[PDB]
Amino acid sequence: MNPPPPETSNPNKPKRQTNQLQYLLRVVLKTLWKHQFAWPFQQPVDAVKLNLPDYYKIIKTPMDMGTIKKRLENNYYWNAQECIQDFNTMFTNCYIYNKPGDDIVLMAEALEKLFLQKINELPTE
Ligand SMILES: O=c1[nH]c(-c2ccccc2F)cs1
C-alpha cells in the first residue's frame, strides 16, 4: 500500500529562486535524469506496482527525482542545500531498503557519484 507522495507545494512554506537552485534543475537534475540508471528514481516508489509491500514499512521519508523536479519547478526550496538533502535522502533510502551489491544499489551508487561530481562546484549567488 502506498502513502501519499511527498508534497511538491506548500503555501505556508516560503519560496526562493537562486542561481544554485536554477543550476540544480537545469544541469544537475536534468543531466542525471538522462542516465541509463535513472529510471527507478524518476517517480515515487509504487509498492503495489513493484510488489514491494514492505517498502513503506521500512522507508519513512521517501524521495525521488520526479518529486525533486517538481519542487524545483515550483520554487519550493529555500536554498540549494535543501534540495541536495532530498537527493541524499533518495540515495540513502535505496541503501536502507536494499543490500550491498543489489542491482538497484549499484544503480544508486553510480548516480550518487555523478551527482557529487556535478554539485562539487555550484555557481556563485
Ligand atoms: O529502493 C528502490 N527499489 C526500486 C525498484 C525495485 C524493483 C523494481 C523497480 C524499482 F524501481 C526503486 S527504488
| CATH number for the domain harbouring residue 90 | 1.20.920.10
Question: Domain count of the chain?
Answer: 1
CB 72 within 8 A of CB 21: yes
6 lies in a domain? no
Closest alpha carbon to 83 in 10, 39, 17: 17
What is the rounded CA–CA span in Å between residue 104 and residue 33? 16
User: Which of 99, 97, 90 minimizes the C-alpha distance to 71?
Assistant: 90
Q: Is residue 7 part of a domain?
A: no
In the numeric block, which cell numbers belong to residue 108?
544508486
Q: Which residues, 6 or more positions from 103, have their beta carbon under 8 angstroms from its beta carbon?
A: none
Query: Domain limits at 90?
Result: 18-122
Please indicate, yes or no, if residue 60 is contained in any of the structural domains: yes
Q: Is residue 50 part of a domain?
A: yes
Q: Are 98 and 105 in contact (CB under 8 A)?
A: yes
Instruction: Give the 3-state secondary structure of residue 113.
Output: helix
Q: Which amino acid is at 77?
A: Y
Residue 51 lies in a domain: yes
- Residue 79 is classified by DSSP as S
Report the C-alpha gap between 9 and 36 in whole angstroms: 29
Q: Is the CB of 50 under 6 A from ligand 1?
A: yes
Contact 9, 88 (CB under 8 A): no
Taking the C-alpha atoms of residue 93 and residue 4, their distance in angstroms, rounded to an integer, is: 17
In a domain, 58, yes or no: yes
CA angle 34–47–95, rounded 5-degree value: 60
Residue 12 lies in a domain: no
Give residue 23 CA to ligand 1 midpoint distance, Å: 27
Resolution of the entry in angstroms: 1.5
**What single letter denotes the amino acid at residue 122?**
L
Amino acid at residue number 19: N
In a domain, 1, yes or no: no
Q: How far is the CA of 13 from the centre of ligand 1 (A)?
A: 30
Elucidated via: X-ray
Residue owning grid cell 537545469: 26
